UniProtKB/Swiss-Prot annotation:
Residues carrying covalently attached carbohydrate according to the record: 3, 208
Protein name: von Willebrand factor
Location of the VWFA domain: 17-193
Cystine pairings recorded for this chain: 12-198
Transmembrane segments: none
Organism: Homo sapiens (Human)
Superkingdom field: Eukaryota
Length: 209
């Protein structure tokens, strides 16, 4: 038994696999990265986290991707939120969006054994990868598109890869971007982002018998 009641009245109770992808570069200071994690935790509090409802994954990406939470991890929501809150600051020279989308496509959504859930990757971006790393970027985004993995880029600050964000937006109509000036704007956009992605996901049918 690992179920927990909602903390808030605002609560997504739909069939959803939601992946948080966190920029691990030094474009975010340690303090800004704490705000980014607080946003992720705030969003998690507003999800009904359960294998039967909303599943979550949390990945920090630098030149490679490090998963802290996988969709299949059967832990209490509060423990998942604690894990997210403690994601270590990397401050890397490089954060590769191409590598983390590859990770999402071939490690997270490799095997679609939950066909009843919508699949969304929230790509929190504050930087630009070296162009040498981007050869397959469009191919991974298209691979995700074909598995109906909706990619929602959140561009934070002026160093965010806006060219890639626009590329993501054009691959699928549901791939909506949120472009923010700084991590301090995350809190005021949070419930709008939650509502947008909740609306994308299927409802569970009314309980019977
Ligand atoms: Cl009934």
């Amino acid at each position: 038994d690992i179920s927990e009641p909602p903390l808030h009245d605002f609560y997504c109770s739909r069939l959803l696999d939601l992946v948080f992808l966190l920029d691990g570069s030094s474009r975010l200071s340690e303090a800004e990265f704490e705000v980014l994690k607080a946003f992720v935790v705030d969003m998690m509090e507003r999800l009904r986290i359960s294998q039967k409802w909303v599943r979550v994954a949390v990945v920090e990406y630098h030149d490679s991707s490090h998963a802290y939470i996988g969709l299949k991890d059967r832990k209490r929501p509060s423990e998942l939120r604690r894990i997210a809150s403690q994601v270590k600051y990397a401050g890397s020279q490089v954060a590769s969006t191409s590598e983390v989308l590859k990770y999402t496509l071939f490690q997270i959504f490799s095997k679609i054994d939950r066909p009843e859930a919508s699949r969304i990757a929230l790509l929190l971006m504050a930087s630009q990868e070296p162009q040498r790393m981007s050869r397959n970027f469009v191919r991974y985004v298209q691979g995700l598109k074909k598995k109906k993995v909706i990619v929602i880029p959140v561009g934070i600050g002026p160093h965010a890869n806006l060219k890639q964000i626009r590329l993501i937006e054009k691959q699928a109509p549901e791939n909506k971007a949120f472009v923010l000036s700084s991590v301090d704007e995350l809190e005021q956009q949070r419930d709008e982002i939650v509502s947008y992605l909740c609306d994308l996901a299927p409802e569970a049918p009314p309980p019977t018998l």
